Enzyme design. Structure first.
Site, PDB file in Angstrom:
ATOM      1  N   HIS A  60     104.861 -25.932 -40.463  1.00 56.41           N
ATOM      2  CA  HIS A  60     105.909 -24.908 -40.634  1.00 56.41           C
ATOM      3  C   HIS A  60     106.389 -24.410 -39.274  1.00 56.41           C
ATOM      4  O   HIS A  60     107.350 -23.659 -39.241  1.00 56.41           O
ATOM      5  CB  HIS A  60     105.326 -23.739 -41.430  1.00 56.41           C
ATOM      6  CG  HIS A  60     104.109 -23.142 -40.808  1.00 56.41           C
ATOM      7  ND1 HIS A  60     102.824 -23.648 -41.009  1.00 56.41           N
ATOM      8  CD2 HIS A  60     103.953 -22.054 -40.000  1.00 56.41           C
ATOM      9  CE1 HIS A  60     101.961 -22.900 -40.339  1.00 56.41           C
ATOM     10  NE2 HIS A  60     102.624 -21.905 -39.725  1.00 56.41           N
ATOM     11  N   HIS A  63     102.786 -24.616 -32.215  1.00 56.46           N
ATOM     12  CA  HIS A  63     101.998 -23.654 -31.431  1.00 56.46           C
ATOM     13  C   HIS A  63     101.687 -24.243 -30.072  1.00 56.46           C
ATOM     14  O   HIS A  63     101.384 -25.443 -29.987  1.00 56.46           O
ATOM     15  CB  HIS A  63     100.706 -23.312 -32.169  1.00 56.46           C
ATOM     16  CG  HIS A  63     100.932 -22.586 -33.446  1.00 56.46           C
ATOM     17  ND1 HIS A  63      99.852 -22.308 -34.279  1.00 56.46           N
ATOM     18  CD2 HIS A  63     102.013 -21.977 -33.984  1.00 56.46           C
ATOM     19  CE1 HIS A  63     100.302 -21.601 -35.297  1.00 56.46           C
ATOM     20  NE2 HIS A  63     101.599 -21.354 -35.133  1.00 56.46           N
ATOM     21  N   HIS A  90     104.187 -18.940 -29.699  1.00 57.32           N
ATOM     22  CA  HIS A  90     105.033 -19.736 -30.597  1.00 57.32           C
ATOM     23  C   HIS A  90     106.363 -19.011 -30.827  1.00 57.32           C
ATOM     24  O   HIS A  90     106.531 -17.896 -30.312  1.00 57.32           O
ATOM     25  CB  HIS A  90     104.311 -20.003 -31.925  1.00 57.32           C
ATOM     26  CG  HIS A  90     103.972 -18.757 -32.684  1.00 57.32           C
ATOM     27  ND1 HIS A  90     102.689 -18.235 -32.714  1.00 57.32           N
ATOM     28  CD2 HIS A  90     104.733 -17.938 -33.432  1.00 57.32           C
ATOM     29  CE1 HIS A  90     102.717 -17.107 -33.433  1.00 57.32           C
ATOM     30  NE2 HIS A  90     103.969 -16.899 -33.844  1.00 57.32           N
ATOM     31  N   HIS A  92     109.634 -18.129 -33.890  1.00 53.33           N
ATOM     32  CA  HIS A  92     110.163 -18.140 -35.259  1.00 53.33           C
ATOM     33  C   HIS A  92     111.678 -18.335 -35.109  1.00 53.33           C
ATOM     34  O   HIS A  92     112.247 -17.846 -34.122  1.00 53.33           O
ATOM     35  CB  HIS A  92     109.848 -16.861 -36.047  1.00 53.33           C
ATOM     36  CG  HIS A  92     108.387 -16.608 -36.210  1.00 53.33           C
ATOM     37  ND1 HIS A  92     107.669 -16.904 -37.368  1.00 53.33           N
ATOM     38  CD2 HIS A  92     107.476 -16.175 -35.309  1.00 53.33           C
ATOM     39  CE1 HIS A  92     106.378 -16.568 -37.160  1.00 53.33           C
ATOM     40  NE2 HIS A  92     106.265 -16.109 -35.933  1.00 53.33           N
ATOM     41  N   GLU A 102     111.923 -12.262 -36.704  1.00 53.82           N
ATOM     42  CA  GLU A 102     111.073 -11.570 -37.693  1.00 53.82           C
ATOM     43  C   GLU A 102     111.340 -10.079 -37.631  1.00 53.82           C
ATOM     44  O   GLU A 102     111.739  -9.502 -38.663  1.00 53.82           O
ATOM     45  CB  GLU A 102     109.615 -11.977 -37.421  1.00 53.82           C
ATOM     46  CG  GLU A 102     109.361 -13.411 -37.845  1.00 53.82           C
ATOM     47  CD  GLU A 102     107.947 -13.760 -38.304  1.00 53.82           C
ATOM     48  OE1 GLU A 102     107.803 -14.376 -39.358  1.00 53.82           O
ATOM     49  OE2 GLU A 102     107.021 -13.399 -37.571  1.00 53.82           O
ATOM     50  N   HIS A 115     106.588 -15.017 -29.926  1.00 53.39           N
ATOM     51  CA  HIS A 115     105.286 -14.314 -30.114  1.00 53.39           C
ATOM     52  C   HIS A 115     104.297 -14.845 -29.062  1.00 53.39           C
ATOM     53  O   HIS A 115     104.029 -16.056 -29.047  1.00 53.39           O
ATOM     54  CB  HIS A 115     104.757 -14.492 -31.529  1.00 53.39           C
ATOM     55  CG  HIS A 115     105.560 -13.740 -32.529  1.00 53.39           C
ATOM     56  ND1 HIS A 115     105.588 -14.006 -33.890  1.00 53.39           N
ATOM     57  CD2 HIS A 115     106.463 -12.746 -32.305  1.00 53.39           C
ATOM     58  CE1 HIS A 115     106.374 -13.120 -34.467  1.00 53.39           C
ATOM     59  NE2 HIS A 115     106.919 -12.336 -33.546  1.00 53.39           N
ATOM     60  N   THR A 195     102.020 -12.350 -39.331  1.00 54.78           N
ATOM     61  CA  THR A 195     103.216 -12.542 -40.210  1.00 54.78           C
ATOM     62  C   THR A 195     103.119 -13.829 -41.043  1.00 54.78           C
ATOM     63  O   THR A 195     104.067 -14.207 -41.736  1.00 54.78           O
ATOM     64  CB  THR A 195     104.509 -12.525 -39.397  1.00 54.78           C
ATOM     65  OG1 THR A 195     104.553 -13.696 -38.561  1.00 54.78           O
ATOM     66  CG2 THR A 195     104.645 -11.285 -38.547  1.00 54.78           C
ATOM     67  N   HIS A 196     102.000 -14.516 -40.995  1.00 59.25           N
ATOM     68  CA  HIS A 196     101.712 -15.779 -41.723  1.00 59.25           C
ATOM     69  C   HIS A 196     100.321 -15.599 -42.310  1.00 59.25           C
ATOM     70  O   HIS A 196      99.506 -14.898 -41.715  1.00 59.25           O
ATOM     71  CB  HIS A 196     101.810 -16.985 -40.769  1.00 59.25           C
ATOM     72  CG  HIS A 196     101.770 -18.309 -41.460  1.00 59.25           C
ATOM     73  ND1 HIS A 196     102.924 -18.911 -41.937  1.00 59.25           N
ATOM     74  CD2 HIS A 196     100.745 -19.125 -41.812  1.00 59.25           C
ATOM     75  CE1 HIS A 196     102.595 -20.047 -42.553  1.00 59.25           C
ATOM     76  NE2 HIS A 196     101.277 -20.198 -42.477  1.00 59.25           N
TER      77      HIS A 196
HETATM   78  N1  LIG Z   1     103.216 -14.763 -36.299  1.00 56.09           N
HETATM   79  S1  LIG Z   1     101.990 -14.011 -35.663  1.00 56.09           S
HETATM   80  O1  LIG Z   1     101.645 -12.868 -36.486  1.00 56.09           O
HETATM   81  O2  LIG Z   1     102.185 -13.774 -34.262  1.00 56.09           O
HETATM   82  C1  LIG Z   1     100.619 -15.135 -35.754  1.00 56.09           C
HETATM   83  C2  LIG Z   1     100.742 -16.241 -36.579  1.00 56.09           C
HETATM   84  C3  LIG Z   1      99.751 -17.220 -36.671  1.00 56.09           C
HETATM   85  C4  LIG Z   1     100.005 -18.418 -37.503  1.00 56.09           C
HETATM   86  N2  LIG Z   1     101.214 -18.899 -37.780  1.00 56.09           N
HETATM   87  N3  LIG Z   1     100.979 -20.050 -38.396  1.00 56.09           N
HETATM   88  N4  LIG Z   1      99.697 -20.311 -38.512  1.00 56.09           N
HETATM   89  N5  LIG Z   1      99.060 -19.299 -37.936  1.00 56.09           N
HETATM   90  C5  LIG Z   1      98.559 -17.056 -35.929  1.00 56.09           C
HETATM   91  N6  LIG Z   1      97.557 -18.032 -35.956  1.00 56.09           N
HETATM   92  C6  LIG Z   1      96.271 -17.926 -35.295  1.00 56.09           C
HETATM   93  C7  LIG Z   1      95.350 -16.983 -35.992  1.00 56.09           C
HETATM   94  C8  LIG Z   1      94.785 -15.912 -35.467  1.00 56.09           C
HETATM   95  C9  LIG Z   1      93.866 -15.288 -36.335  1.00 56.09           C
HETATM   96  C10 LIG Z   1      93.755 -15.886 -37.540  1.00 56.09           C
HETATM   97  S2  LIG Z   1      94.763 -17.216 -37.624  1.00 56.09           S
HETATM   98  C11 LIG Z   1      98.430 -15.943 -35.110  1.00 56.09           C
HETATM   99  C12 LIG Z   1      99.440 -15.008 -35.017  1.00 56.09           C
HETATM  100 CL1  LIG Z   1      99.080 -13.577 -34.110  1.00 56.09          CL
HETATM  101 ZN   LIG Z   2     104.585 -15.379 -35.009  1.00 55.43          ZN
END
Ligand SMILES: NS(=O)(=O)c1cc(-c2nnn[nH]2)c(NCc2cccs2)cc1Cl
Ligand SMILES: [Zn+2]
Length: 256
Positions: A60, A63, A90, A92, A102, A115, A195-196
């Site tokens: 989706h 990263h 990453h 959006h 977002e 982000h 947000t995911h």
């Molecule tokens: N969009 S966001 O809120 O900045 C965010 C999105 C994801 C994400 N998007 N797709 N898959 N994972 C993420 N993954 C790593 C993780 C950290 C802790 C548990 S999973 C971390 C952040 Cl902070």
């Molecule tokens: Zn994000």
């Protein structure tokens, strides 16, 4: 999980009921309702380009991950007493230039959002431990406004050709993502969530007042990544932005 009708933001609440929680992200920032907080210190970022590790197609999105075994790359200041350790950045984006951020500001939608994500290495010893803690994560968000091509994106965009399909990964080295931040680090902060999925309410959001640029054609490079695995029919990654969520009495603080 994705952004389609059957695996998307409206479907997440069936396995992640926190989706309907009180600290969900992203939000619309209403500037008339923000509270200037004199105690907020300047954001300080100090990232070592040697910590850049890998770029990954996650289906989706994509990263860019960083080595996070030590404090070579840290965020401090703003609302924080603890140092946070860089682990990922990453983006959006949306199906067209009209939307794709977002966060919104006074209801205005931007074309994309950066982000830059960090975990609390002062209090916890791993991302996995930090991930679910209310003080565990710190994410800088930067709104991306369609206009002039942004040359600071070039290494990131040049890398995408090696990770075109879901699950491909490649080395991505010698990159300091502080080069992507706006020149002013004036910010809004509020308590929110990933947000995911799994949508943990573990994120202190730092949302930059100043946008950065991106061209129509640079956005098209993001939308040309493929969500399918190699050999399947190509399915472009059209959009990956979650809608804004209710503030539920939270206060957005302004550094400015
Ligand atoms: N969009 S966001 O809120 O900045 C965010 C999105 C994801 C994400 N998007 N797709 N898959 N994972 C993420 N993954 C790593 C993780 C950290 C802790 C548990 S999973 C971390 C952040 Cl902070
Ligand atoms: Zn994000």
């Amino acid at each position: 999980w994705g952004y389609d009708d059957k695996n998307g933001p409206e479907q997440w609440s069936k396995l992640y009921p926190i989706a309907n929680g009180n600290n969900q992200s992203p939000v619309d920032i209403k500037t008339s309702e923000t509270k200037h907080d004199t105690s907020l210190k300047p954001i300080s970022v100090s990232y070592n380009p040697a910590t850049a590790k890998e770029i990954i197609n996650v289906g989706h999105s994509f990263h860019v991950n960083f080595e996070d075994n030590d404090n070579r790359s840290v965020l401090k200041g703003g609302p924080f007493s603890d140092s946070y350790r860089l682990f990922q950045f990453h983006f959006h984006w949306g199906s067209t230039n009209e939307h794709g951020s977002e966060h919104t500001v006074d209801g205005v939608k931007y074309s994309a959002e950066l982000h830059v994500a960090h975990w609390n290495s002062a209090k916890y010893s791993s991302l996995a431990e930090a991930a679910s803690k209310a003080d565990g994560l710190a994410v800088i968000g930067v709104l991306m406004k369609v206009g002039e091509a942004n040359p600071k994106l070039q290494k990131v965009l040049d890398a995408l050709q090696a990770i075109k399909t879901k699950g491909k990964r490649a080395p991505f080295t010698n990159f300091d993502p502080s080069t992507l931040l706006p020149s002013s680090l004036d910010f809004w902060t509020y308590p929110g969530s990933l947000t995911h999925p799994p949508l943990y309410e573990s994120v202190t959001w730092i949302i930059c007042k100043e946008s950065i640029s991106v061209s129509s054609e640079q956005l098209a490079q993001f939308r040309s990544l493929l969500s399918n695995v190699e050999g399947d029919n190509a399915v472009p990654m059209q959009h990956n932005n979650r809608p804004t969520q209710p503030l539920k009495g939270r206060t957005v603080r302004a550094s400015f």
